[PDB]
Amino acid sequence: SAAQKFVKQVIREAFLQDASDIHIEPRQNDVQVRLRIDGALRPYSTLPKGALNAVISVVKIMGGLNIAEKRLPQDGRVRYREGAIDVDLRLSTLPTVYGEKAVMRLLKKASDIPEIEDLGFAPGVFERFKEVISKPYGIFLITGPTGSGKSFTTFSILKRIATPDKNTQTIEDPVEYEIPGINQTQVNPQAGLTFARALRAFLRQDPDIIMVGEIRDSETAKIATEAALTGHLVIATLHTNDAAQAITRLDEMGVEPFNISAALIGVLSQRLVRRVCEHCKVEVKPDPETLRRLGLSEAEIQGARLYKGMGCERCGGTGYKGRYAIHELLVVDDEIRHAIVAGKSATEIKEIARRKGMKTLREDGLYKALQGITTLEEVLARTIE
Amino acid sequence: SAAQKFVKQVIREAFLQDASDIHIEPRQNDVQVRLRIDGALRPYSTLPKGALNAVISVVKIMGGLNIAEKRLPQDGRVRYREGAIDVDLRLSTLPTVYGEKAVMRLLKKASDIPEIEDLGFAPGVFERFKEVISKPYGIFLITGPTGSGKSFTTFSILKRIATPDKNTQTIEDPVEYEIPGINQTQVNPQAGLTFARALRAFLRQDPDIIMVGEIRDSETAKIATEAALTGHLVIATLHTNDAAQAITRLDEMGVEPFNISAALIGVLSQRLVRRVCEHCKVEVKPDPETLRRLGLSEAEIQGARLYKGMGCERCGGTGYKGRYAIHELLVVDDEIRHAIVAGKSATEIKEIARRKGMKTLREDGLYKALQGITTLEEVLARTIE
Amino acid sequence: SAAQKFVKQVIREAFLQDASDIHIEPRQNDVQVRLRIDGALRPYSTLPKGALNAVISVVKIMGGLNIAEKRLPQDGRVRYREGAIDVDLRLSTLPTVYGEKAVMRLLKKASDIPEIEDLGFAPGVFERFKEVISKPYGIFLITGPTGSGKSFTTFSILKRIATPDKNTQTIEDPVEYEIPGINQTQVNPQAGLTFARALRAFLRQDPDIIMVGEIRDSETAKIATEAALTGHLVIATLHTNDAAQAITRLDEMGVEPFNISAALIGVLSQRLVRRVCEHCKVEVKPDPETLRRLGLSEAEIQGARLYKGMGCERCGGTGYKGRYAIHELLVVDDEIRHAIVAGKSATEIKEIARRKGMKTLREDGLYKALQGITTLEEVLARTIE
Ligand SMILES: Nc1ncnc2c1ncn2[C@@H]1O[C@H](COP(=O)(O)OP(=O)(O)OP(O)(O)=S)[C@@H](O)[C@H]1O
Ligand SMILES: Nc1ncnc2c1ncn2[C@@H]1O[C@H](COP(=O)(O)OP(=O)(O)OP(O)(O)=S)[C@@H](O)[C@H]1O
């Protein structure tokens, strides 16, 4: 067909450019198609309004979606294959004013998961991070907004840690990609298999490592914490702007600070900044007023260099190509446990940690921005500085 | 054709007078016709009682309603075109003791939606408003009664922030304006497309900005907060007499307070006041004693220029033409976060917010009455403070 | 049948090596079986993928699990006896991506039933325990999670109170031990001999002490309570984490509040906590804030020491050797009854009880931990939320 011919090419072009998502959107007069690359959407094509139905058909067919239904959202999955390329897609259709909208999400593979040496950790923090994950039990929290690289990190860790002498059990919503040598369980709300329900079962499963996909309940916060106290390694995900507030979040979710204190081994706060395109990279001579505001001594200010991409055909005008990770790693020690009990605020916990040598998201992004890995713009945007 | 001539004229006059609604009311010995202008009903004309059924007939033909049925309400939509007039009309017929009443609403378009610079924000509030909508994720609430300008503000915001690198998704009941650049979806009961069912689907649609037209049920209030939590920007409308009560209401609706404190960027409480007609505008010497019980200081009573419109042909005698918005903008910071958890009252929150810089509705009203934008009574009639 | 033979061989080999746990894990092309020996998982054997369901059915029948239910976790206990192979198995089935995973833990072979003086009650709590179980009649509830030591405690009580001048009748699912001096009846669902059917018969068997293995009906709860009212002593097992919630549990099962208030002598809640290896004990300097937060008085904090096992040859790798029980004893008085009728919450009731001097599991666990019986972390794990 011609609609079949379009879906093949847009998926192929997405796989070739490492696009995260494909948006097929009807509008007043046309159909716009967009690709998400490096977290940001780009224009790809524009179709005649009549093209919409046939295209939606091709997509819905791939995922076993009902062509008859156009009044309700639908959800499908397809293992898509075209000679060279092989990728799973999650298809989503949504009724819109101008007709159904389709979104195709290209899922990653276990192949794609990095080793912990290739995460982007600075030299000093890397050795601390290597240490905290090597502990035999406790709970290690990874926090940040969606698209922060949190899953990539958690599985990077599990890739180094889940050896055959251990049981590695995972609760996930959904399971994105299957990992060899660990046990994975998928949340099933229709059946009633919730995060809290599966976690309770894990305790009956002789676990060694438990991966909690996401902590939203009080209930899962307690069980995840109880697994930790029981003597297991717990890797879980929380949604917090900061490392320290993960401590306060657990308190508000109802974990008493003495439980938190006896189980929390460390918190990692992750954000994902965009990487300056190499072809169109250009030095910008910077601004002493910022750098001043992130109290970089005025000895490290005129030594400092900053960079931006200019936009070229090789980055679609973006000035960016690929992404990089920035890290705020809070390691729990004997001065911090005491501050968790006694009830210090997140701000107070953080000043202690920083005074021990914790680098913040800002301070990390900046160190990477002074290498031209990313722009100062991107750093202040994803964090708050 | 005489009834056709009347309907033709009254829509023409409503159009030119910026009239929300036309009211055609059967009364004991006549028919009364009123225009709502600036939110206030206004006498337009009187018809002789035996002319009712001809006029209702014209109105029904326009919206394709049944003439035979006079015992049950009816509803229609017409795209009205006469001369240079192009308006969408919503038609309502309803049996009353003296016959059927008719209401025709004149609908606005996307072109009527202002730029955020033209929303009427005081300069100190406007800079904070801007910093609130420019955040990457979180939930921002716009509260107040119907006809307060909630939608105008919402889309004004989306005009500035729904840039083409982002997915901007809408759920609405109904979709009012057709907006370029964004994706809109309408609630559909008959198909089972709830607010909550739509919103659940949005989370598999790779969204950046989410707009929830109205939060009515407890489930929708939870999913929108969740979506904010995970890393999405959410703009939603709520009904509260006060900015602080939007916090409390989410609580009452079932949202975990730790989730509220975590996701909430801010609240905007809004009303509409009437502008002083400036063909009537006559300066009025303020009464200091009355301006003192109203919490204004001695400095503010100086530099106070009050006005009242002495009715004219252009303002229909009311002394007012046009409307203006008054604002109460709660910006969430850490102290408001700690008070949201720990279950402080709305009154407690409010006093925190003010101490931190928030102007109440009354205060923003008074401030603009001293600029002669509006009059004192309008401020007092639109604010219980 | 080939499946049945495999399961018998694995349990045989686990038994003989003294393996802790047996793991049957589906994989992508493979069903992998692992044994945990001396703390580590070792590879036992590999089964083809198409053998998975056959094996899972075998182990489900052994633990009385549902074969049909494949998308929820299940749990059962089994006593495996084939020849010299005699071992209590805890069975756990977990839904995973490649199918159901089954885990079987080999339980430490049950020790002989002790005197109530060796159950490990605190000195003060013990005097109350002794006083509750001396009562001539009424119902005494023993409650807690699976493997709490419930059955072990009830038979220890029966060891003391079941005297030859009394008839002591027992309804069990199933019968575990072989105690002299008493009469024991096992539930036969096949024959129609239910918990409730037996309990009505017991009232025609002239009893003195009745023991119900489990209350999981309304009718059983109602008959057991009725038996307590007429003037029989009833020891019964519930599965509630909190002692005070066990009262609410009976109300949910339909027992009239006034029959609960008149019959309930008290409720025992217990946990099993791992014990520190004596040959390996070290002193830990505890944190005053933590102790304070756990309700310890300033006098007690003064010379408080805590203990940990470092890992010793005697205790394998872990610093723990054997178990000990912690207790929470709710003794019903006149005030409690008044709360039950016109029912206050389990929270209020627990408050009242604590005000009358009732020790909590954590408080009980703490003091035992303060003596070196166990670690705080073991105590915190079994008392969380
Ligand atoms: N360290 C990294 N360096 C560069 N790119 C990365 C890195 N980690 C992740 N990415 C990319 O960014 C995307 C974000 O993926 P994720 O790791 O899932 O982030 P996440 O949203 O925090 O994970 P979730 O939502 O908890 S399942 C990945 O698909 C990769 O394309
Ligand atoms: N800032 C403003 N200044 C002056 N007039 C305004 C302003 N905002 C809105 N209006 C007028 O007031 C009318 C009602 O505003 P809306 O925003 O549509 O009402 P709303 O009830 O607050 O929100 P809804 O219920 O979702 S339409 C608009 O149609 C305009 O005519």
Ligand SMILES: Nc1ncnc2c1ncn2[C@@H]1O[C@H](COP(=O)(O)OP(=O)(O)OP(O)(O)=S)[C@@H](O)[C@H]1O
């Ligand atoms: N106070 C105790 N100290 C040491 N070990 C105990 C104690 N109580 C029980 N145990 C042992 O731990 C196991 C406890 O099992 P039970 O006493 O049967 O518990 P239970 O509460 O009946 O569990 P369920 O739900 O009936 S399977 C038994 O093997 C006991 O031998």
Ligand SMILES: [Zn+2]
């Ligand atoms: Zn470039």
Ligand SMILES: [Zn+2]
């Ligand atoms: Zn005028």
Ligand SMILES: [Zn+2]
């Ligand atoms: Zn030891």
